[PDB]
Amino acid sequence: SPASAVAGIAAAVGAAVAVGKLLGGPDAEAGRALSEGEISLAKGVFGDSIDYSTVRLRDEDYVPWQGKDYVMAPNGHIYFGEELRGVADWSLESLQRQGLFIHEMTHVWQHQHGVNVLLVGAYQQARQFLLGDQYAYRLEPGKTLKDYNIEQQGDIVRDYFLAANAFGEASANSRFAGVLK
Amino acid sequence: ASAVAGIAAAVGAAVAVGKLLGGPDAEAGRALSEGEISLAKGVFGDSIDYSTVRLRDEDYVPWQGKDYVMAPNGHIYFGEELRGVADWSLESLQRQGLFIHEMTHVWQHQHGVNVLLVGAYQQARQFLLGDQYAYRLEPGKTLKDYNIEQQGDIVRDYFLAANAFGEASANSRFAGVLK
Ligand SMILES: [Zn+2]
Ligand SMILES: [Zn+2]
């Protein structure tokens, strides 16, 4: 069983390097670019920290093993699954659907700030599965965003956006002020 | 620590390439020539369907070498330095031996072997665990008791012995390993 852990994690990173090297870098001209409302939505969270020009919404899977009800953001482009296709404007969808979009955008923000969301992601996803680590983040004093895994990083940012839209900036900034910089 | 990691990462990358570009385009590449079918028939006979077999003068993966050849799916992928060969049967005996070696994997694939996974595992295990790549014939050891790669070398070296020293000298040395 501890033999399965090292093996499983390495095999998952190996598969990530393979996909990375194989279909290396996305076609800037392919997909669809962010809408006026979508740029506004993300600007309210990320501001001018990300170049929204780069960001592309592709209604196609990144890999054949990607789920029907799943979304990937490895290269700074967002790949929508079979059940999440046909959305022209994410800013004109439900608050929970908008939250999903802010989540994927955090991976796009990570990528734009020098993070290998493909490798780092594959490693952390496999490590939390086999090493049984808790899926849900737990806020701690002295812990910044960067001390969490790339998926929790997203969950945090999304949950902040949802708190700020549902309970106002007052309630949101009190809880998330520590973790964000 | 590096061994378990390295081997698993190598098999993981193989499953990824396998799942990703799964199965080759039967109509793509180039099919075996009359001479090439004859060449292989003398070794493999009617054990393989030569119709399936396709010679593609393109890399299987970007990390494949200039002086390297891959045969993972029952199609042969030629590297940068091995391109432009219209007929392998009209090339040097050593160049024909290479072709028989690649054909052994094509024969393994056609007989139920996952050349991609089994290969990636064995190649990585032989590198990190520093195990002897070069086969050494042993009594009681059948071809199936050797690496998918050794299996390729054994069959090729047999073909070369049979062409250079005749079937007499070749069949005396290789009769044991082959069935
Ligand atoms: Zn995600
Ligand atoms: Zn080979």
Author numbering:
A (entry chain A): 833 to 1013
B (entry chain B): 835 to 1013
What do the paper's sentences say?
Beyond its canonical trimeric spike-forming region containing gp27- and gp5-like domains, VgrG2b harbors a C-terminal extension, rendering it an evolved VgrG protein. The C-terminal portion of the VgrG2b spike protein is predicted to function as a metallopeptidase because of the presence of a signature zinc-binding HEXXH motif. In this work, we find that the VgrG2b C-terminal domain (VgrG2bC-ter) elicits toxicity in the bacterial periplasm, counteracted by a cognate immunity protein. The toxicity of VgrG2bC-ter results in profound morphological anomalies characterized by blebbing of the bacterial membrane at the site of septation, a phenotype reminiscent of inhibition of the cell division machinery by β-lactam antibiotics.
We solved the structure of VgrG2bC-ter, encompassing residues 833–1,019, using crystals of both the native and the selenomethionine-substituted forms with resolutions of 3.2 and 3.0 Å, respectively. Two copies of VgrG2bC-ter were found in the asymmetric unit of the crystal, which could be superimposed with a root-mean-square deviation (RMSD) of 0.1 Å. In solution, however, the purified metallopeptidase domain exists predominantly as a monomer, as determined by size-exclusion chromatography-multi-angle laser light scattering (SEC-MALLS), with a dimeric species also present. The VgrG2bC-ter protomer possesses a single domain composed of six α helices and three β strands, forming a shallow bowl with multiple small loops. A PDB search using the DALI server identified several thermolysin-like metallopeptidases as structural homologs of the VgrG2bC-ter effector domain. One such metallopeptidase is human angiotensin-converting enzyme 2 (Z score: 5.0, Cα RMSD of 4.2 Å across 105 residues), with the active sites of these proteins displaying similar architectures. Although metallopeptidases target diverse substrates, the overall core fold of three α helices (α2, α3, and α5) and two β strands (β2 and β3) is highly conserved and bears the classical HEXXH catalytic motif typical of these zinc-dependent enzymes, where X is any amino acid. Indeed, the conformations of the HEXXH residues in our structure are suggestive of metal ion coordination, and the geometry suggests that the electron density in the putative metal-binding site corresponds to a divalent cation such as zinc. The assigned zinc ion is coordinated by the two histidine residues of the catalytic triad and has a third glutamate ligand (E983) at the top of helix α5. These features permit classification of VgrG2bC-ter as a thermolysin-like gluzincin within the MA(E) metallopeptidase subclan (Rawlings et al., 2018).
